[PDB]
Amino acid sequence: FGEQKDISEINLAAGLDLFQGDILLQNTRWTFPIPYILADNLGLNAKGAILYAFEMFRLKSCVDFKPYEGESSYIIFQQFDGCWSEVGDQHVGQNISIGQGCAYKAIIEHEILHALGFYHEQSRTDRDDYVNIWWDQILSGYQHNFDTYTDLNTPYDYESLMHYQPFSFNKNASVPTITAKIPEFNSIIGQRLDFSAIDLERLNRMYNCTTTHTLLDHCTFEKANICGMIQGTRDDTDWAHQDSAGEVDHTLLGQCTGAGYFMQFSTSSGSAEEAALLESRILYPKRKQQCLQFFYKMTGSPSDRLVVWVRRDDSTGNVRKLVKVQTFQGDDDHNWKIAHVVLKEEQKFRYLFQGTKGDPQNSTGGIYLDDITLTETPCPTGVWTVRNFSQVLENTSKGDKLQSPRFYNSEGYGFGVTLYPNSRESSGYLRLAFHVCSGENDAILEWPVENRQVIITILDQEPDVRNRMSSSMVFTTSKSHTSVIWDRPSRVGTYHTDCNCFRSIDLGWSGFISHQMLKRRSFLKNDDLIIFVDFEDITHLS
Amino acid sequence: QKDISEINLAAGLDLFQGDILLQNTRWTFPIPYILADNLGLNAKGAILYAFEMFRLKSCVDFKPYEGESSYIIFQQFDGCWSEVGDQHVGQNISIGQGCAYKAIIEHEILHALGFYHEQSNIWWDQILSGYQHNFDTYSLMHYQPFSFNKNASVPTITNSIIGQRLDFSAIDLERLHTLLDHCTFERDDTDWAHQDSEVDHTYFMQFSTSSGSAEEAALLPKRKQQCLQFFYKMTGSPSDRLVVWVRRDDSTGNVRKLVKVQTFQGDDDHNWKIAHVVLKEEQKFRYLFQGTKGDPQNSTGGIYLDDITLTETPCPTGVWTVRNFSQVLENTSKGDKLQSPRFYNSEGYGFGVTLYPNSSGYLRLAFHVCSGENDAILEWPVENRQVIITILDQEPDVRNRMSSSMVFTTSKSHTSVIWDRPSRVGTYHTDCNCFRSIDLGWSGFISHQMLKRRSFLKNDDLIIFVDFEDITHLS
Amino acid sequence: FGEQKDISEINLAAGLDLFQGDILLQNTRWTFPIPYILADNLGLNAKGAILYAFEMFRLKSCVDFKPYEGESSYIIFQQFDGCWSEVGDQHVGQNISIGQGCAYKAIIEHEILHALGFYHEQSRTDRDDYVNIWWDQILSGYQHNFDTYTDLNTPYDYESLMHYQPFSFNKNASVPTITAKIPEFNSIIGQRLDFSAIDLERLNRMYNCTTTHTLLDHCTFEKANICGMIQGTRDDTDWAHQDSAQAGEVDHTLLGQCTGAGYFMQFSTSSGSAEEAALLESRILYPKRKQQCLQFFYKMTGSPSDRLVVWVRRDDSTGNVRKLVKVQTFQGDDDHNWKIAHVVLKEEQKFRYLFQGTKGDPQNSTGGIYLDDITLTETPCPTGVWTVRNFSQVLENTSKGDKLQSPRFYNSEGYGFGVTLYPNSRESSGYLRLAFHVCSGENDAILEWPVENRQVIITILDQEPDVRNRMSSSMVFTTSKSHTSVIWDRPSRVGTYHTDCNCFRSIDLGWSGFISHQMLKRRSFLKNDDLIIFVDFEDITHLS
Amino acid sequence: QKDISEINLAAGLDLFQGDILLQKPNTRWTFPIPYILADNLGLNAKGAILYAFEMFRLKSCVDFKPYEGESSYIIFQQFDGCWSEVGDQHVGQNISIGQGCAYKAIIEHEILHALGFYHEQSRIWWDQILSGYQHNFDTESLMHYQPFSFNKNASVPTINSIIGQRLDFSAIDLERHTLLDHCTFEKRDDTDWAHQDSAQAGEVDHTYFMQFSTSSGSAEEAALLEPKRKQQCLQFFYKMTGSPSDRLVVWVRRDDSTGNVRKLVKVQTFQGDDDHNWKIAHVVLKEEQKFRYLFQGTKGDPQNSTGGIYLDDITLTETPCPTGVWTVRNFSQVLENTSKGDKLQSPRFYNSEGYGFGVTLYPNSSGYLRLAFHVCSGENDAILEWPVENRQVIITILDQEPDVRNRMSSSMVFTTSKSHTSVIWDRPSRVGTYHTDCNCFRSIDLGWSGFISHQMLKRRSFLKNDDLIIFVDFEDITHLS
Ligand SMILES: [Ca+2]
Ligand SMILES: [Ca+2]
Ligand SMILES: [Ca+2]
Ligand SMILES: [Ca+2]
Ligand SMILES: [Ca+2]
Ligand SMILES: [Ca+2]
Membrane topology per the record (chain D)? Predict the structure, then answer.
């Protein structure tokens, strides 16, 4: 794929001269939902990436989008030269361009923020206060892209998705055109992760947003009211709200004395098959599917059991009907784990955790919970936790590699992630690459695999899913990838002993994230690197 | 189970032909219906079960009475009766206590749909005085041999079929929504072979596993939910595997998106078997069987399929197949018993069936609740859950089936309360490592003559379906 | 004054039988600003208390209030029997009653939340999951006030100002009618401090609020961008940003409870040349009133010759922020603990606040200037501020009816006054008593006596840096000729002499149960073991 | 400072009566006069014109406002010479303020022409006039021709020591908005202020005076004696012979917003010391609604007091107060005892932005007094901008006359600029000389060697009480750029 280029490099290479690089110039605030059209010229990877960007907006703001219906104003997405947009609505159909390199989540989010009404962060009048502009290092004629002019009463943000990178319109790669007056920020400006917390604040103050479209419930256990959860009465005992005073919480990891709370069910005493029930408050879903994400730990007997249940409506408006959803079992890990459970609730319901004592005569520990989130989105297909990443990074040379355990999609395709901690082609970067694995389904499946989107995402472990800045990369499997890479691994795959399976050649972004960035933004919380991977058919957008 | 003529005689009624109230005349579907508050919750659940049978075997449909010129209201005021024919005005149907059995309910509804009795030799000298007019002239709709009878030693009508209470006969259905597909058979590496009687369960489809490479394979709605039923056999390696897949629409009108639904793994029972798979398809789709070779050298047989059906109904919560039932019925004295495996419902209650092949001249089934790993999250005593026990008619076409069924609702009135948490009221059995409740059921569930009568004992297998569902929402 | 009564007791004493104790049941959301009328029957203390409640709404939400002027829907405040309101926007007229005894901040805030559209927390459909109703302990014929009657995806709030106290409609004072299922919350339910965080979240979701009318700036320094502040270029050095991990350093935001987190600004005075300085400066701020209060925490361990100067830079009338004006000077002294400062600004045009540090004699200084927890609000600064050191040790070492007295403060007119604190209240076991008194001073000959129609507002500062999440306890009264033992005549006549001020103090008047000890220990009121009290004393004759 | 006739002669101009432009029924202005300050007009000249307009508003009903497109507007520009068109032309008309015309009395002259006036010139030493110019003599006043105007030989006047003054308007020039209150006293508390008639030796008025005695009664006994702009200056003369513990407090009572004036705000406190002479006080008021000023006298120690508090000559103007004030006692003795180049230095004064400054006085400059401004290092220096530029120095010798119509205060103005070198206005610790009296560096003095003549001081009331009172102002005018 190659290193992701900045929008200013793309539009310069495309021979454009729009105002401020990506802004085109031919009462101006939208009324939600914004009508959209994905045009036929727009490539399949770009269509998929645009719909992934819309899910981020719904998870983090009140912004929403719909297919066209004969409405007054609308956004048409097309594959023209360069990445560009027209700032604010303009009352008859406006056009966003995404083409020949623009198909990245953060670049599409950027072009949509222009259409919502935002200008560049560095375009504000008070740039001369926060950043230096090296005018002698800007390319000839392109100085006009650094001119200024709108009072939402908010501070200047170096993390803003709407900021230029240190090397924008730059005549020699050795010397940046922009530098921060606070030196720590020189490696922050022009990030391509996600919306900053100040970007979401400004979007919400401009559009009177007070709630998001796809977040139902969120609980870190840090308030004594336990987020309005309730304890069972028909069960033998109760969950204790503990305060981190030989264990640490996942919200703060014991870095704070007193602060830091988690729920515990002690398995070291009492009768076998005694249980404790923790239940949510009544929730009202707005989609057919939800993902319950939580962090848990087990140290007791292997026979101890954390079961996830739903109690849903009886169709008469009484929340009485139980259903058993997933079971987690005790083992030898003894560290905090991430769990995902797919719910499918179409009517009002509650989520319940049932801890149960398996062998209390041979247990000296228990079950722990922290950091719950419920979203109205699909759950990540594969999740890979690399323990002790800092030590992995210090013990590996350039071009040493780790491989995930084998994973499987809904159709039954097998796949995995290869991690190189010290990237061969990019010194000081981590390289992630995607490979297909042979499996028990290879005869019912189609080959070569095509039109499936791969989404790889490094999780920012921030407890509030709104403020997470997770790094993501996306691609679509195509016959144009040759060495065809995606043919049945049996014919061309390099055999591996650890799965008794054939792995395809791996085609992945050489620079996924810098080592410097990995250190910050809670990505390596607990020194665990957490990678999400999705592999899904997008042929229906064609 | 008492007869309708007995129930109405015991109620002290004197209706036309024993169960008709005499106060064009054909319905327009769906029939608008209202369930009265007086009507029992157990009766309401049984009435819904009867409605499902009507939709499955006939065009007849039932809808809530939001507004219509004519409709049916079900009452428990006095005995069991139904005015014959649509009255052009809202009519009335009575479901007497002791007549909640599904058969009795289907009978009353057949009168509302317009039927008179099938009999309408008669021994007039054996009839009760003052009831001879119920035998005047002018199947589920026939009198029993001892209807209005004065002396149990002699019948009023002459035999063993008449006044059956299984289901609609094929003639009752001929004289009168939820079936999608049915078949008796009469990109992948290899094909399934269509083969002839290695005897058919009804022709059958065979995928051979005795040759070639490992992991070679062969491939063969109006509501929200469906049940796929099929018969299968495996004789190859225990490594061999039958997989059930759905291919569904991607919403562009293209059935392409695969989803894996169930896997069946080879095992040492080499007989034919019955499987149920729940499909949850809300758009157009296909069901696919993937056969796959697990270890060809070790394998000396194949995978076989026969008697497929797909219905828009919930799959049975547990299924038990008692093998060599003729030999079981011979090998058991009165009060010898068999117990099913430990099944579970959606709420996680554990349960089973106890069978006593010699009850006199009847088989006896009884339901019991087993302790399970969910006993702490569950509610006790269990109430307002309906139990359905059914003996399957193995007839492959679901329209033609006359499956025996019985029903009851768990209630604090059942004492010896039988339904409290089994660890406190029940007794420990080593064979499940579990506590079993007292067993409650019917001493007369089916006659030994009946099991022989309608191919229930095909392959000498007896197949029992059991369901245990919360019906509190009807209250 | 006595103990503050609950709204249920006040209406029950008035013999009323309203819906849910305080609702009158004669598109239903308001359009801001809400038109209001303060009726002629409404007493002077109630008028002053209602205007004080409107300033809380403008600090914590987008709610705002304006004069009648002939609009179709308006709130009329009147002095009928009981404390009660209608619910929502009638669109014709709405009466809210601030009866006798209703004139306390949190009661007026409650009635205004009813008019904004809120019902009680203990009447929700899910309630029976979260609290127990002891039906045998309710008074005969009042059980309808605990019946169940709006879904915003918000959880059940025990802290809600809209929740009933444990003894509401109770037949026996020893047994509660309500108890929380989570047992810690039994002393939280029915609090009368302020809006909870969840109360404000629900108010803001229901009205599409994203900002507040009277907050201009806030900064705790916990983000490395220093909340949009900038360093000076014309000065001699820079302010550092320090992490509280070093021995002998501690941030005011988290007080080292967290480790590897907690930040403050430092200017070192332990080296360099005399009269070197450093500037730290705000973003460009746009005021919407004539007056502002800058509140910040500071500490000075350096030479008593070191100086912290607050400056403003304001617009020159060309639209360029260039004109400097000097505002306040703070000097080094021997109290090395954290201190609270308040500086009044009077800016009518866009401006920037600046802190200048200055090194005086670094030859003999081993310390420096420290800053944390800045806030700027469009409200008048507190007239007097009293910090009681080691309060937990004071509370343990004092007996019942021992006392402490504040320094002597002055109001704008020049009246001298102070606060008397009794840590272990005589009349209210487990409470702290605060009481006001007037002190003789150098202005007693120009001032009017007996002092009447002035309003006293006493507040205990919650110390939470983000002003939207403070739950400060506040109490109010108006000086009146009825107060006799007249208490408010010139202190040299009616007072007693005190050797500590060489002055005369009036008889002290206030609330014996000002706050419970359990409440002070729960929230940030005793942060660092400093208790911070604010007091105000202003003329409200113009509301008459 | 040169005369206007010399400035227009140096420009080589030949205008009607030397400074009137004639462009060709009855014409006369209707106030306020609309005006424009042109972009070509230098920064010192813009500031000097605005100081001249405050004199018009302080002394007359004349007023000035910005352009609104009416038929008549006056545009001020930097052409050659100082000149004007007499009276309203009924169209836009121009005033020229050339190089050297920035002095207030020259601007006041050109404006008097714009209002409509002619010189008092009337039927002169013809043999002393420059060849050809004789027509400019055809037929205290500011407009009166200077004695040496249109003169061929500096040894002899053409036209005695009063004529052609450049102080201010005479009373007669005013005879041909910003004063609120004025009193010379000549026409809840414990006791009263005594109106007193100067009948006791050693107790004489500054002009009758108001007296609060401190030699009897109890301590802390008191007596009380009780707008079109946002800001006002209360000027008064006071004296305090009593205890150093005695106080004079200035208080304001303002409208409470019901229309009743009851609220009291403490404004300034003045404290007794061992200077028993009359002092001049300035108190800034900031009143936007109706109000009363109050003086509270208070007895500090009646057991160690043999005197009192005295007040005289109150005035209240809707203008900023003077930034710094200096009172040179016994000037007549100073002027006799000093030689050429002996000096006195003012106490350090601070503007609103915090720049430290002062004045140097040389009493014998020949026969003139020399005043010069300097910047002093102070506690703010690190935070201030340097070199200081675009701040306007005004130095004024107050004519002590209590009625503000009758004052003729000598005033000079300049604007700090990088062009001033010997840059004089850089930070005094870099470019100045250190002094032990202030413990501070002082920048090089810049000012006028001929600020006023010793003759002019005697004629006016500047030397009342043998006090010379100097006012100084140092304010940012960058916004006029
Ligand atoms: Ca936690
Ligand atoms: Ca067959
Ligand atoms: Ca801090
Ligand atoms: Ca600096
Ligand atoms: Ca008096
Ligand atoms: Ca006088």
Answer: Single-pass type I membrane protein
Q: Which helix (H) or strand (E) element contains residue C203? A: helix C197-207
**From CA B101, how far away is CA B85, in angstroms rounded?**
22
Q: Which residue has the tokens 């040179």?
A: D328
Is C542 in contact with D258 (Cβ distance < 8 A)? yes
- Of B325, B331, B247, the closest CA to residue B289 belongs to B247
Chain A closest CA to B436's CA: distance in Å? 17
Contacting residues for A313 by C-beta, under 8 A, at least 6 apart: A319, A321, A347, A348, A349
Distance CA C93, CA C77 (A): 11
Cα dihedral A207→A209→A215→A219 (10° resolution): 140
Q: Comparing C-alpha atoms, which of D243, D235, D242 is closest to residue D268? A: D235
Q: At what angle do helices C44-60 and C105-116 cross, to 10 degrees?
A: 60
Q: Which of these, B120, B177, B128, B159, lies nearest to B6 by C-alpha position?
A: B128
Residue the block writes with tokens 């100002």: C161
- Could you say which of C235, C236, C323 has the minimum Cβ distance to residue D476? C323
> At residue A514, what is the residue type?
S
End-to-end Cα, chain C, rounded Å: 22
The burial class, CB within 10 Å (0-12 / 13-18 / 19+), for A480 is: exposed
- Ligand 6 centroid to Cα of residue D313, in Å, is 6
| A181 in contact with C, Cβ within 8 Å | yes
Q: How many CA atoms lie within 13 A of D264 on its CB side?
A: 21
Resolution in A: 3.7
In angstroms, rounded to a whole number, what is the distance separating the alpha carbons of residues B443 and C338?
Answer: 87
Distance of CA A193 to the CA centre of its chain: 9
What 8-state DSSP symbol labels residue A111?
Answer: H
Q: Give which of C340, C331, C417, C344 is closest to C385, Cα–Cα.
A: C340
Q: Which positions in chain C touch D263 (Cβ < 8 Å)?
A: 412-413, 539
Distance spanning both ends of chain A, measured CA to CA: 22
Q: Which of C335, C344, C368, C357 is closest to C530 using CA atoms?
A: C335
Nearest to D447 by CA among D393, D389, D382: D393
B428 close to B434: Cβ distance less than 8 angstroms: yes
Distance CA B359, CA C30 (A): 75
For C250-297, give the DSSP string: --TTTTTSBSS---EEEEE-SSS-TT-EEEEEPPPB--SSS-EEEEEE
Max CA separation in chain A (angstroms) = 80
Record the tokens describing residue D334, joined without a space: 């100073």
The Cα–Cα gap between C15 and A203 comes to: 51
**Alpha carbon of D434: minimum distance to chain C alpha carbons (Å):** 16
Is B194 annotated as belonging to a binding site?
Answer: no
Residue A535 CA to residue A378 CA, distance in Å, equals 12
What residue type is assigned to position D14 of the chain? D
Q: What is d(CA D347, CA B82) in angstroms, rounded to the nearest whole number?
A: 119
How far apart CA B84 and CA B22 sit, in angstroms, is: 8
Taking an 8 Å cut-off on Cβ atoms, the answer to whether A232 and B377 are in contact is yes
Query: DSSP assignment, residue C228?
Result: G
Cα separation of the two ends of chain B: 25
SS3 of A369, please? strand
- C398 vs C390: CA distance, rounded Å: 12
In 3D space, the residue among A368, A369, A387 whose CA is nearest the CA of residue A300 turns out to be A368
The method recorded for this entry reads cryo-EM
CA distance C203 to C188: 21
Domain boundaries, chain B: 1-177, 178-317, 318-475
Using the 8-state DSSP alphabet, how is residue C467 labeled? G
